[PDB]
């Protein structure tokens, strides 16, 4: 038998990956200097440099995972890989929209919003109950030392649960690229005025 990838997903072009990575680093520098963040440093961990705090960063180019397959060992991996839309789309370019950036004490990431065509590539957990399909879609930008990058999607889902119910509060800041919200418990969300568009190739990563 042939094995499957470690995971499928959208892998950004170098130019797009560079643009988004730089936007994430600027956000981290801006957020860490904001009075509202500094005041709540107790709920999070002299000043903290968030670039340092998020000291594990993706090597190479950034990506947005669809289905983790573990070469076929993960539940649902074979069903996912055999879909016509997955086979037809393999190697094809797509444009992903980034609508928000977020930081928690564990991860820093970018929220991805998918087109209908891209949702067809999203696979069919309790953390996401009552949210739209594809809510977990994200690009990991940084993790704290003891954190695994899969936490980024769980962090996003938790943020979205508060946003859904209107608990994001009034905006606590305007940054150059959008509106900043303090969600409590170390969680911060920058809702971008203009969605960022990044070009990516849907393919499989093998390690």
């Amino acid at each position: 038998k042939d094995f499957l990838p470690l995971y499928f997903g959208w892998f950004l072009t170098k130019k797009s990956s560079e643009t988004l990575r730089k936007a994430g680093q600027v956000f981290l520098e801006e957020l860490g200097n904001h009075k509202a963040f500094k005041k709540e440093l107790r709920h999070f961990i002299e000043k903290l440099e968030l670039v340092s705090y998020f000291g594990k960063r993706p090597p190479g180019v950034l990506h947005c995972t669809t289905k983790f397959c573990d070469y076929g060992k993960a539940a649902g991996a074979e069903e996912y890989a055999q879909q016509e839309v997955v086979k037809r789309s393999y190697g094809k370019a797509f444009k992903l929209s980034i609508s928000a950036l977020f930081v928690t004490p564990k991860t820093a990431g970018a929220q991805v919003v998918l087109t209908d065509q891209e949702l067809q590539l999203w696979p069919s957990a309790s953390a996401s109950e009552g949210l739209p399909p594809g809510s977990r879609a994200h690009v990991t930008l940084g993790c704290a030392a003891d954190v695994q990058p899969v936490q980024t999607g769980l962090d996003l889902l938790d943020i979205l649960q508060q946003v859904k119910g209107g608990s994001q509060g009034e905006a606590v800041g305007e940054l150059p690229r959008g509106k900043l919200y303090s969600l409590g418990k170390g969680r911060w969300m920058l809702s971008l005025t203009k969605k960022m568009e990044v070009k990516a190739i849907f393919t499989g990563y093998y390690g």
Partner: nanobody, 121 residues
Framework: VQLEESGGGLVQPGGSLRLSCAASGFTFSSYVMSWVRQAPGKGLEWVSDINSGGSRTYYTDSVKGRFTISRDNAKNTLYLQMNSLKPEDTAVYYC???????????????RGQGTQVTVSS
């Protein structure tokens, strides 16, 4: 980008309203469209959204089975049929461009002026 809501009003619990939102200034048939609402003393919260062709809809668990979102792309109009209304449904309702997940509705330029819905005796 223009969004004009209408259809709000006062109703008794169990009653019905239909909100409308006429869109202009963009290619309406290209966009997911959303309804959000803000109850007194609370933040803007999700209600429902609908994809461009109208084939996919989303509802928060709190309105599921009672509200129906729909659209008429030829008339560039979005609708929210609100049945079996409860006092908990009292709020200002806003139509917004793009999906709920996109949080476009958090930006003033992306939403309409809002329409009052009040449910009591």
């Amino acid at each position: 980008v223009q969004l004009e809501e209408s259809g709000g009003g006062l109703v008794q619990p169990g009653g019905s309203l239909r909100l409308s939102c006429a869109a202009s200034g963009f290619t309406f048939s290209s966009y997911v469209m959303s309804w959000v609402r803000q109850a007194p003393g609370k933040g803007l919260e999700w209600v429902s959204d609908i994809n461009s062709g109208g084939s996919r809809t989303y509802y928060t668990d709190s309105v599921k089975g009672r509200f129906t979102i729909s659209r008429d792309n030829a008339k560039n109009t979005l609708y929210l049929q609100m049945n079996s209304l409860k006092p908990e449904d009292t709020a200002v309702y806003y139509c917004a461009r793009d999906s709920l997940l996109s949080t476009r509705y958090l930006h003033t330029s992306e939403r309409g002026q809002g329409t009052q819905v009040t449910v009591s005796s």
